[PDB]
Amino acid sequence: IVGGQECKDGECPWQALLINEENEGFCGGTILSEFYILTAAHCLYQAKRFKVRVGDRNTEQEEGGEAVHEVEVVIKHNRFTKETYDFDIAVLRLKTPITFRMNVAPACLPERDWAESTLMTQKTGIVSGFGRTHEKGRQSTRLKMLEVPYVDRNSCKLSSSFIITQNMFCAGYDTKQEDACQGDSGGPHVTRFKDTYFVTGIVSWGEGCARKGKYGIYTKVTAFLKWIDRSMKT
Amino acid sequence: KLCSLDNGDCDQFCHEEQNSVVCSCARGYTLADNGKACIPTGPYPCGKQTL
Ligand SMILES: C[C@@H](C(=O)N1CCOCC1)N1CC[C@H](NS(=O)(=O)c2cc3cc(Cl)ccc3s2)C1=O
Ligand SMILES: [Ca+2]
């Protein structure tokens, strides 16, 4: 996350971090239930073998709420394509169930029509993660969150050098220096409604981080609600 | 009008059925007596920051 603030105690409890062999974060995730994590399909081509970490806010110490989980089944969308990042979505089934507590809890799944007319027409969404702090920096040791305005579909297409499919949306800023970034991928885009937080996207791609004239691109979760429901059943 | 007038007064999901607002809630919540509010059924319900 370029810009934004730290997540304070209890504020981003649905964050999940995908970790490689070196206990090193390379992608984010969203806790959907005691057994399921939502992430980006393109994250699965970034580590031979990985685990899932939840309950963590500072990777440089133990605050006592941390929990690591092994993955039993990886469920990747079959229509996912490396060439455009279309259908960039996957669910992970965990070997052991997540025990909810301070800093560990799920985000809610919305229903499609209500989310598209009521959530997605809200001024902003919220993206969070342990990714780079600026295009050329290192990853954050602190979990961060950032408020990102929804971006008109038409402008987003004009601004983009790459194709924006019906399965994607745009958020972020035209010029201001705040955006998601490298390492935040597969992470949560949630929208707040009456003190309740609903999943609205997954961090997918961008032409750098916070570049003038470019927006952040996210997987349109609302197009995938039936697919998520199926995957969560086997 | 209806779901477009302040969310139909619903806490969560709003749906129109024949000139009438119908409220509902995400999984883990049950609809309140007044057919509008969503009540958490157990601890650590989805979408809530932990305290
Ligand atoms: C243009 C795009 C890309 O590689 N594409 C090829 C596949 O199809 C989609 C575009 N791209 C360039 C580098 C960038 N990688 S990145 O640095 O990890 C990155 C992801 C990302 C996500 C969001 Cl939401 C904002 C900024 C960034 S910064 C990225 O995805
Ligand atoms: Ca820690």
CATH of the domain at A187: 2.40.10.10
Resolution (A): 2.1
Range of the domain at A59: 13-106+223-234
Residue A109 C-alpha, separation from nearest chain B C-alpha, in angstroms: 7
Handedness of CA A3, A166, B23, A31 (dihedral sign): negative
A85 lines ligand 1 (CB under 6 A): yes
Whether residues A17 and A3 fall in one domain? no
Choose among A216, A16, A204, A227: nearest CA to A112: A227
Which phi and psi (to 5°) does residue B37 adopt?
A: -75, 150
Contact A187, A202 (CB under 8 A): yes
Cα dist from A20 to A25, A48, A88, A154, whole Å: 7, 8, 20, 38
Whether residues A152 and A67 fall in one domain? no
Whether residues A145 and A198 fall in one domain? yes
Per the structure, the count of domains in chain A is 2
A135 burial type by CB count under 10 A (0-12 exposed, 13-18 middle, 19+ buried): middle
Whether residues A141 and A208 fall in one domain? yes
* Coil, helix or strand at residue A44: helix
- Experimental method of this PDB entry: X-ray
The enclosing domain of B18 has a CATH number of 2.10.25.10
| Stretch (H or E) spanning B40 | strand B38-40
Per the structure, the count of domains in chain B is 1
Range of the domain at B7: 1-51
Indicate the pairing of strand A15-19 with strand A196-205: unpaired
Which phi and psi (to 5°) does residue B13 adopt?
A: -70, 140
A positions 130-189 inside 8 Å of B (CB) = none
Whether residues A217 and A129 fall in one domain? yes
A135 lines ligand 1 (CB under 6 A): no
Contact A143, A12 (CB under 8 A): yes
Whether residues A92 and A149 fall in one domain? no
The CA-to-CA distance between both ends of chain B, in Å, stands at 36
The b-or-e profile of A114-134 (16+ CB within 10 A means b, else e) is: bbeebbbeeeebbbbbbbbbe
The CA-to-CA distance between both ends of chain A, in Å, stands at 33
Whether residues A6 and A25 fall in one domain? no
d(CA B44, CA B31): 17
A205 lines ligand 1 (CB under 6 A): yes
Which phi and psi (to 5°) does residue B3 adopt?
A: -65, -15
Contact B11, B1 (CB under 8 A): no
For chain B, what percentages of helix, strand and coil (3-state, to nearest 5) are there?
A: 15, 25, 60
**A195 has a chain B CB within 8 A of its CB:** yes
Whether residues A7 and A112 fall in one domain? yes
| Dihedral angle over CA of A188, A228, A215, A187, nearest 10 | 20
Choose among A35, A68, A49, A40: nearest CA to A218: A40
d(CA A40, CA A188): 10
Whether residues A60 and A98 fall in one domain? yes
Q: Return the number of other C-beta atoms located less than 10 Å from residue A45's C-beta.
A: 9
Question: Cα–chain-centroid distance for residue B3?
Answer: 12
d(CA A168, CA A25): 24
Whether residues A88 and A172 fall in one domain? no
* Tokens at A30, concatenated: 């969203």
d(CA B10, CA A110): 14
Whether residues A24 and A7 fall in one domain? no
The b-or-e profile of A177-200 (16+ CB within 10 A means b, else e) is: ebbbbbbbbbbbbbbbbeebbbbb
Whether residues A214 and A120 fall in one domain? yes
Which residues of A are catalytic, by number? Answer: 42, 88, 185
Q: What are the chain A neighbours of B43 within 8 Å (beta carbons)?
A: 100
* Tokens at A61, concatenated: 């110490």
